């Protein structure tokens, strides 16, 4: 329906740390 | 259906068709092939060096086509006979062009444009002259080989299931005549090897251009789903008109196109002016007729008040002259080539031009209106032959009481007087004697350097004509008391002209004037140059000042054609405004001594009399003007150019005497036998004895010129102000002869063009006729002539500076070249050149071009620019290295590399180009890339790119390379002359400069400025660029070897600067609904991608477009004149950061004086920073050229209203940071409008979670105060921003 | 010395980003 929010890079690094750890 | 797949597939098949047997895979970043050339082979053979297998490798590579050099295949480029797969069409235009071919016996040596001359197998002198003229006349230039264009046309035609007629004639030619010529891929200017006629290159080039147009309309109509275009209520086929014009202009295109372009423009101007009802667009602006505060409301229809006026004599005569002009054009075309065709649809259009209505709100009318203007682009640049003709003093009109020449001279002198007074009123004064040697660099941009200068480098001697180098090398000899008193009125001392090409008209000629003449002109004309460039004046006739009456200087100052020409749209939609535009024929010829010279020199002398006390090296002022203007210096001066050649017979040359054959000093073309004098040549010249051509050598042929010259420092000023005087005379005369009939509301003058907005208080016919007759009689009495065929007197149409407005809308004309070029361009930077071309294509699509076709053209050109630039470089086992060894086993091979088309859509910063596939006006960046991949709707667009972004090899760029080997024998003797009082004082004293050097000024300190300016002038010169290009290969191999296929997106580009990627620190949200009402704009002819952007976001009503700190600084530096080419705002920011904060205004003023800056500009700039003091940060904004193109400046973006409407940001962020956020917001909103996503306000959200706030706090602390330059620059911690950082996000 | 990112690894994690976007909306 609508485009979602554009996440900041820090949330992406949080996902990085979640995937690696 | 996404463009990124069909475009890629099309370009790929174009690749295979160009190079058979290619392995150009889609997924690979680039493709590498090898090519063979034997040009070095024969010369290596002749000098005793031997090789291995002679030409046998050709003998096998053509058939078996699997030669492998380290496994890399070697291919060959496809020959002409198979480019179109042998198809034929039997086009009538083919035999028309065949009939157009003419034998050599009919040559006219002084033709402006060459005809279609046949090539003979035997060799003779006349056809060597034909070859000599053709090689520099009939040439193409450009940046892409034409075969690439032909393959693209062929496959695009196949894809569209449509056939263009230019392709048909090309195929019919190549089917039977095979190879027409040859072009060097590395050097496109080397065209040679003519085969059938000497006119065949341009023909093919022209045959290409038409094809593009035939595609353009074919796509454009598809975007509007209409079957045919509309003229009133009649169907019309555009391709019919195009092919009609094509078959007409075939035999002698340049001349007849040039002489036939004008009636098309007249027709499109006069269409629909007398429709019984009329449809207009509502508009509103200020009281003044030149105001720019325009907004648009609605479409309306209203009765036409002037419908009865068009039955007058003037309009009937204009129509008659235009149609008869068409008749001479068509009969000349029918006489030259045996054809019986005519221009049918055009006369059925033209017979009823006044009465047929025009509909701006219908796309069918609008596309046609733009199309007729865009037709004239097919022929390239109008390269024309020039000749030298005497002035013929007998024809000019002597002053007499029955005329008004003396009145014109008196008025122009008086006008010059108040021009100088108004210039003085803005504290602009002439240069002091020291200031003259400081700032003769202040010469106008229209000036041309006459003499050349020599640059010696280490040995090698080069010549140049640039203003900077010529001034720096020999300015002290310009005003020396040896060259000043001589006169250029003898055979030994003359001046030589130059030539320059223009996109549409014939080759213009320019006058090259020695600096010893322009400098006295400079001294008296420079303040006018500084003054009249101002914008936004008052054009009321009753206003005392004349500053706003001149449009010269207000040319592309705003940067947006729609924005700075809003007055045309406003006045074209007003029922109460009648506009009159007067243009002259042979205007510059009519600037004679009787009407233009004497009065203007008297005015100059009278205005310079108050300044006569100033001693310019002991020369009094009036005598300095005597140097500047006088007999034998500017007036009655001989000019050199093309050697006039007379046709004779070789036998008559045999009967000539030996003394008559005595060649003098003057150069003669190699195809012409020289003799001594013209008079002895007149003894044998004959019209029927066509055997040979003869040119004199004694120097009795070069012309004598007395009129105005285009090389002067104030050419435009003089022509415009003469126009002002003539305008005042015509207003006075029309007021005298008919009181109250016509009242003038506004007058404007620019160059040789005038414009009047008036109110007409009558509808009677004969009164209008007699008024027009009076105007023409006054112009004739003023010693000039105005052509009634192209003179404009209309209610509802406005034209100004190649801008056309009809009934409130903007009708663009497309005149930008895509195939040819005005001058040979050497691409020292492929990335910058591609950015320039995408800028040009953005402008073109804003003028109504098809968007998708533009994307296709750029995806074509993004792959072949870099090719053929690499040489002396070989790649083996994936390692790049130097060309073999002394083994010379494969000395004849060269490496060719082809980039991927999709590299058009990968950002700069990586090895790509910042184009965006959704809309060209959006600049692709790394943050833009990551947001684009985070949006679902764009996924199908992004998928082909999605797997390529890491495989793009580095680009080529020579200007960045520099070496310590830059030693030049030419030295400096003038930096002490350009030095201003502050730096002169600093250099004069013995040892205070050591104390001065402790300041953070650096390389711009006194003493060091000299070496910096030598370095900049040398790096901006093309004399030594060939050595740098030759040496650049080694660093290029180094860069390729060090290339790594990794992508990093460093958020902080550099310690001192910041970019839009900073905006990714926070989260962005979309919420809130807004007003969905569409806006109104005059440029209705747009592609849908641009149209929806203009719909959602209205036109820019606000004049201000927001301003960053660095742009404020360089706009301030614009006021400076001498150092605009050497001082950037970056150095100013560096010094102010390194100098400290607590300094006062006067300290900064003194520092800027030691920076050589003018005191008033320094005062303004220091006052600006002392106002900005508290909220000033140490941050630099590095934008990647976003929001700077043609179209975006029309949108209501990057303004304060836009920020208040669409953006909400936390108050913590400082000025540079919110500027970056604003740029990010502009890009995002434009993107969301382009895709059709619903419009919502953007939120910058910071969450209460402590870890996140700590992370942004640490990042901001690093950004403002980095750990690296806190050591070096030793910044003060007392700045308000760094202290505020302590508890800003706690 | 600060925070970096890699496009190549971001290529294979888009599904979780879509998931968290859907969760927020």
């Amino acid at each position: 329906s609508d485009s979602g929010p554009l996440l900041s890079v820090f949330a992406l690094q949080e996902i990085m740390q979640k995937v690696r750890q | 259906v996404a463009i990124t797949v069909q475009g890629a597939q099309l370009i790929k098949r174009v690749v295979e068709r160009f190079y058979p047997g290619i392995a150009f895979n889609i997924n690979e970043g680039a493709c590498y092939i090898y090519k063979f050339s034997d040009h070095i082979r024969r010369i290596r053979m002749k000098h005793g060096t031997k090789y291995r297998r002679q030409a046998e490798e050709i003998i096998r590579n053509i058939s078996l086509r699997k030669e492998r050099l380290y496994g890399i295949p070697v291919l060959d480029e496809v020959e002409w006979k198979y480019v179109f797969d042998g198809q034929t069409f039997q086009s009538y235009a083919f035999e028309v062009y065949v009939n157009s071919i003419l034998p050599w016996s009919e040559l006219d040596p002084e033709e402006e444009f060459l005809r279609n001359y046949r090539v003979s197998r035997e060799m003779t002198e006349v056809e060597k002259f034909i070859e000599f003229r053709a090689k520099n006349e009939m040439q193409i230039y450009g940046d892409i080989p034409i075969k690439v264009w032909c393959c693209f046309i062929n496959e695009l035609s196949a894809e569209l299931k449509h056939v263009p007629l230019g392709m048909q004639v090309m195929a019919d030619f190549v089917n039977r005549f095979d190879s027409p010529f040859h072009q060097g891929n590395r050097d496109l200017s080397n065209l040679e090897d003519f085969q059938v006629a000497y006119t065949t290159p341009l023909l093919f080039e022209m045959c290409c251009m038409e094809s593009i147009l035939e595609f353009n309309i074919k796509m454009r109509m598809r975007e509007e789903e209409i079957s045919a275009l509309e003229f009133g209520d009649m169907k019309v086929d555009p391709v019919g008109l195009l092919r009609e014009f094509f078959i007409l202009c075939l035999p002698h295109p340049k001349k007849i196109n040039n002489v036939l372009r004008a009636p098309y423009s007249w027709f499109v101007k006069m269409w629909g002016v007398g429709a019984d009802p009329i449809v207009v667009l509502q508009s509103t602006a200020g009281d003044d007729r030149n105001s720019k505060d325009v907004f648009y409301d609605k479409f309306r229809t209203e009765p036409n008040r002037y419908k009865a006026l068009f039955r007058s004599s003037f309009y009937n005569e204009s129509r008659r002259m235009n149609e008869e002009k068409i008749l001479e054009a068509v009969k000349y075309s029918q006489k030259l080539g045996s054809h019986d065709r005519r221009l049918p649809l055009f006369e059925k259009m033209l017979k009823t031009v006044y009465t047929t209505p025009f509909y701006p709100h219908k796309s069918s009318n609008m596309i046609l209106a733009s199309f007729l203007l865009s037709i004239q682009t097919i022929t390239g640049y109008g390269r024309a032959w020039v000749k030298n003709v005497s002035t013929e003093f007998d024809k000019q009109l002597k002053p007499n009481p029955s005329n008004l020449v003396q009145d014109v001279s008196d008025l122009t002198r008086e006008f010059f007087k108040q021009a100088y007074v108004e210039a003085k009123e803005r504290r602009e004064e002439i240069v002091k004697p020291e200031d003259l040697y400081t700032s003769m660099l202040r010469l106008a941009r229209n000036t041309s350097s006459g003499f050349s200068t020599e640059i010696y480098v280490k040995l090698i001697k080069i010549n140049s004509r640039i203003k900077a180098l010529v001034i720096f090398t020999k300015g002290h000899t310009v005003f020396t008391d040896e060259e000043l008193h001589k006169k250029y009125n003898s055979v030994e001392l003359y001046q030589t002209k130059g030539s320059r090409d223009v996109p549409i008209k014939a080759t213009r000629t320019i006058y090259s004037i020695n600096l010893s003449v322009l400098v006295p002109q400079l001294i008296v004309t420079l303040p006018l140059n500084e003054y009249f460039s101002r914008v936004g004046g008052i054009t009321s006739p009753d206003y005392k000042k004349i500053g706003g009456k001149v449009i010269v200087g207000d040319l592309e100052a705003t940067g947006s054609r729609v924005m700075d020409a809003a007055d045309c749209f406003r006045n074209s939609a007003d029922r109460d405004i009648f506009t009159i535009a007067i243009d002259y024929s042979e205007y510059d010829t009519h600037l004679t001594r009787h009407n233009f010279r004497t009065g203007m020199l008297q005015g100059i002398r009278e205005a310079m009399a108050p300044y006569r006390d100033l001693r310019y090296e002991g020369y009094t002022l009036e005598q300095i003007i005597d140097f500047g203007y006088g007999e034998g210096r500017v007036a009655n001066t001989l000019w050199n150019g093309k050697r006039r050649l007379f046709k004779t017979t070789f036998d008559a040359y045999i009967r000539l005497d030996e003394s008559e054959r005595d060649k003098g000093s003057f150069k003669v073309p190699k195809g012409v036998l020289p003799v001594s004098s013209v008079d002895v040549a007149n003894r044998i010249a004959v019209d029927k004895g066509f055997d040979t051509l003869i040119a004199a050598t004694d120097g009795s042929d070069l012309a004598l010129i007395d009129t105005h010259l285009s090389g002067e420092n104030s050419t435009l000023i003089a022509n415009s102000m003469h126009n002002m005087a003539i305008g005042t005379l015509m207003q006075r005369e029309v007021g005298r002869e008919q009181p109250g009939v016509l009242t003038f509301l506004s007058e404007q003058y620019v160059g040789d063009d005038t414009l009047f907005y008036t109110k007409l208080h009558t509808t009677d016919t004969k009164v209008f006729d007699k008024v027009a007759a009076s105007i023409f009689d006054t112009v004739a009495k003023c010693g000039h002539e105005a052509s009634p065929s192209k003179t404009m007197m209309t209610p509802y149409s406005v034209e100004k500076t190649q801008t056309h407005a009809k009934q409130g809308c903007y009708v663009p004309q497309d005149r930008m070249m895509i195939i040819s070029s005005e001058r040979r361009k050497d691409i020292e930077d492929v990335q910058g050149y591609v950015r320039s071309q995408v800028q040009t294509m953005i402008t073109k699509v804003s003028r109504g071009f098809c968007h998708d076709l533009a994307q296709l053209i750029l995806m074509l050109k993004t792959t072949f620019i870099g090719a053929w630039k690499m040489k002396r470089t070989i790649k083996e086992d994936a390692m790049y290295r130097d060309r073999k060894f002394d083994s010379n086993d494969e000395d004849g091979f060269t490496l060719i590399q082809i980039r991927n088309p999709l590299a058009l859509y990968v950002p700069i910063g990586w090895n790509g180009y910042g184009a965006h596939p959704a809309a060209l006006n959006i600049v692709m960046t790394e943050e833009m890339y990551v947001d684009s991949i985070m949006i679902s709707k764009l996924d199908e667009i992004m998928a082909p790119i999605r797997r390529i972004v890491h495989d793009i090899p580095p680009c080529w760029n020579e200007t960045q390379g520099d070496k310590r080997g830059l030693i030049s024998a030419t030295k400096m003797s003038f930096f002490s002359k350009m030095a201003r009082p502050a730096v002169q004082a600093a250099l004069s004293d013995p040892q205070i400069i050591n104390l001065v050097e402790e300041l953070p000024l650096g390389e711009f300190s006194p003493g060091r400025i000299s070496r910096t300016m030598m370095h900049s002038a040398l790096l901006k010169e093309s004399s030594a660029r060939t050595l740098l290009s030759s040496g650049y290969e080694l660093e290029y191999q180094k860069a390729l070897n060090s290339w790594i296929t990794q992508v990093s997106m460093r958020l902080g580009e550099e310690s001192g600067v910041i970019s839009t990627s900073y905006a990714k620190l926070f989260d962005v949200y979309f919420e809130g609904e807004l007003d969905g009402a569409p806006h109104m704009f005059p440029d209705q002819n747009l592609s849908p991608q641009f149209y929806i952007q203009k719909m959602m976001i209205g036109p820019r009503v606000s004049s201000r477009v927001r301003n960053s700190y660095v742009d404020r600084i360089d706009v301030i530096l614009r006021k400076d004149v001498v150092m605009r080419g050497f001082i950037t705002a970056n150095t100013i920011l560096n010094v102010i950061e390194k100098l400290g904060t607590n300094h006062s205004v006067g300290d900064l003023v003194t520092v800027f004086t030691l920076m050589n800056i003018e005191t008033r500009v320094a005062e303004e700039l220091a006052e600006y920073m002392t106002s900005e003091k508290i909220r000033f940060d140490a941050l630099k904004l590095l934008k990647k050229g976003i929001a700077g193109d043609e179209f975006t400046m029309s949108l209501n973006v990057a303004t304060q209203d836009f920020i208040d409407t669409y953006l909400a940001y936390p108050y913590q962020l400082t000025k540079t940071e919110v500027d970056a956020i604003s740029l990010y917001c502009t890009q995002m909103i434009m993107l969301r409008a382009a895709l059709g996503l619903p419009k919502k306000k953007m939120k910058i959200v910071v969450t209460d979670d402590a870890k996140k706030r700590y992370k942004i706090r640490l990042q901001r602390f690093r950004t403002h105060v980095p750990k690296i330059k806190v050591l070096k620059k030793l910044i003060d911690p007392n700045r308000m921003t760094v202290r505020n950082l302590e508890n800003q996000f706690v | 010395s600060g925070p970096l990112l890699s496009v190549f690894a971001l290529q294979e994690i888009m599904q979780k980003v879509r998931q968290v976007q859907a969760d927020y909306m």
Binding site: - | T284, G286, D288, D293, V1101, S1103, R1104, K1173, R1175 | -
Partner: protein
Amino acid sequence: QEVLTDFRRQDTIWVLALQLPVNPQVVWDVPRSSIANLIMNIATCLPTGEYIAPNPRISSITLTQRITTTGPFAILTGSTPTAQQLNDVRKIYLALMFPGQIILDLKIDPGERMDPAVRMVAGVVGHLLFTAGGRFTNLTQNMARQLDIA
């Protein structure tokens, strides 16, 4: 008066089809003709000009004297008008030039929120710009009440 001062002026008979001291009453006896007379007066006698702006140093030393603070005046002293706002300014001046015959009122564009600082500055300047005295007025009663509240 050039026509009456030639050297044959003493032997000339003058004919005049019209007379200048026109009786104004015949113009105003037309039934319900106020609006037509106003339109004719505007179309016949209104001059044209431009809008000048004050010295930039007026507010550079007074309104924005203290950099560290921000008030309702300082936030809008840096704004730049749009074109429609210029049209409204022209309307205000036209209302000023004709006392009594034309009066003003306040409007709210649909979909637009209210800025408090604009309200305060408008309420302050309205008392010094307009007249609502004991002989004629430029404002309606509603506008006066709203300005008083502001």
